[model samples]
Structure formats: structure tokens, C-alpha cells
Target: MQNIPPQVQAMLGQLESYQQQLQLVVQQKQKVQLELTEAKKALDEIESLPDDAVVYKTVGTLIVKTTKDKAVAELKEKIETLEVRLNALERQEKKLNEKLKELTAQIQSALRPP
Candidate 1:
């Protein structure tokens, strides 16, 4: 086997790091997406209920009684925040993916016989 240059090794390490970072971002995005879906569903249900309907929300481990309107508003806010975070993660994922592709191509080219 030919000796790998230190520069190539460093780039390989960076490539692996980017791959890991991208995976973590993807996982976080999935989690946020799931949470956003649940919040939307909860908001919809709250909206369908009668104005006087009672709802319970958890604060830590304890459930506290709350108005439907308040819960709906809270859920909407949460959904918005999650969406923003998801958008940021999506952008990061895109950049990481491009970097990975570029790095892979560069490494391949470098390893080829001159």
C-alpha cells in the first residue's frame, strides 16, 4: 500500500467529521419535524374544540389545567420556533452535503496517479 500524505489524512478526517455533523443535523431536523407535526395536530384539535372546552398541559411532570385558547397559542408559538430551527438545520445540512461532495472529489483526484 502507498503511504498516504498527511494532508490527505487530515482532509479525510475532516470529511468524516463533516459526515458526522451532517448526520447529527439530520437527526435533529427529524426530531424537530416530528415535534412540529405533533404541535400542529394539537393546535388543530384545540381549535376544533368548543370555546369553553378545558385542556391540560404539562409543566414538567405535572399536568396543569389551561384554557384552550392559551394552549393553542402556546402550541402555535412552539411550532413557529421549531420551524425556524428546522430551516436552519436544513441549510446547514445542505452546506455540509456540498462540502462532503467536494472533499470526496478532491481526495479521489489527489489519490490518482500523477
Candidate 2:
């Protein structure tokens, strides 16, 4: 008689968890990408504005009056931070993907046909 090994069963459970974590990581990365694009767009528009133009930025409660240069700097800062977050998430996704692929290979070998 043949049966699935206990370690194989445990690896299957781990595979499920890795897949779930990867799902969330991908979603989170997507959101960060969206934010990064928006910030880049805002930077472009703000730079295109004339020197005398007024720029308003959202403060704690309401909007705050700020210079064009200041707003551009803030947007650039936001873009940089978003890129950092995106990179970190991408690294995490890569690691999780590798783990899942390795585990899947092992599981497949363990369940080989009779």
C-alpha cells in the first residue's frame, strides 16, 4: 500500500500559506505602484505650471498654501518613498515565489505515480 508522507502533508499546508501571503503581497505592490504613478504625474503637472502660479497642498485638516518648488520637492519625496516600499514588497514576493516553487517540486516528487 502507498500513502502520502507526513512531511509532504506539512509542506502542502505551508504551500497554502505561502500562496495566500503572495496574493496579499501582489495586491499591496499594486497599490504602491498606483501611488507611485500618481505622485509622478502630480510632479509633472506641478513642474509644468508657471512660476507665478499658486499650489495648494493638503495639510492635517485642510489645504495649506505652498510654493510650486516646495510642492515639487514633496512629490519627489513621496515618489522616492513609494519606490522603496515597492522594492521591498517585490523582494518579499520573489522570496515567497521561490519558496512555493521549491515546495511544489518536492510535493510533486513525493506524490509520484506508482
Candidate 3:
């Protein structure tokens, strides 16, 4: 039945904002994960295909070589990049968690009187 002091209220607001930002980060991480998963799936399919499988078709009447190998290489490169990005997101998540813990401690301290 008591209202929080202005300073504590402000901190709570800040904490909530940080949590929202963290949520956005989590959503972004999920998107990246999905993309990585799809890429891996495609790579697996390419690897499993028969040696005589037709990987590419020409748009016009002209004949063109199959770009399957090139596509696979690009996908692998992208997977590596995504892995790095995932690692960065994980590090950011850790830092955000630390910040959340610090904020919780601060709120608890504010609730106490000296």
C-alpha cells in the first residue's frame, strides 16, 4: 500500500526498458537461428543428392554449367558468418543478464533503509 520513491521508480523503468531491448535481441537471435537451420538443411540436401543430379537449369535456350558447387560454397560461408553472429548475440545476452541482475540488486537495496 506504499508508492515507490521517484528514484526507485525511475530505475524500474530503466530495468523494464533494458528487458524490452533484450527481448528484441532474443527475437533477432531466433531469426538468425532459423536462417542458419535452413541453410544447413539446404547444404545437407546438396550433399545427399546423386552425382548425376541436375543442380542448375538455363533460363533461356543457352546451355550453362551447374552452379551447385558454387551455391554450396556460398551457403557454407554464410553459415560460418551466422555462427559468428550467433556467438555475438549470446555474449550480448550474457551482458544483458548481468545488467538485469545488477538492477534487481539495486531495487532490493533501495527497498532497504539504513
Q: Which candidate leads the pack in lDDT?
A: 2
**Please, what are the lDDT tens digits per residue for candidate 1 over residues 2-68?**
8779999999999999999999999999999999998899888889999999788899999989998
> Residue 58, candidate 2: how far off, in angstroms?
1.8
Q: Taking the tens digit of each residue's C-alpha lDDT, what string does model 2 give over 38-79?
A: 999989999999988998888888998899999989899999
Q: What TM-score against the true fold does each predicted structure earn?
A: 0.83, 0.91, 0.82
Q: How far is candidate 3 from the true structure (C-alpha RMSD, Å)?
A: 3.5
Q: If ranked by TM-score, best first, what sequence of candidates would result?
A: 2, 1, 3
Best by TM-score: 2
Q: Model 1's lDDT to the true fold?
A: 0.92
Q: What is the lDDT of residue 30 in candidate 1?
A: 98
Clashes of each: 0, 0, 0
Question: In candidate 1, how many clashes are counted?
Answer: 0
Which segments of candidate 3 are over 4 A away from where they belong? 1-3, 57-65
**Alpha-carbon local distance difference test for all models:** 0.92, 0.94, 0.87
Query: What's the true lDDT of residue 85 in model 1?
Result: 93
Question: What is the Cα root-mean-square deviation between model 2 and the actual structure?
Answer: 1.5
Error of 1 at 104 (Å): 1.0
State which candidate, 2 or 3, has the greater TM-score: 2
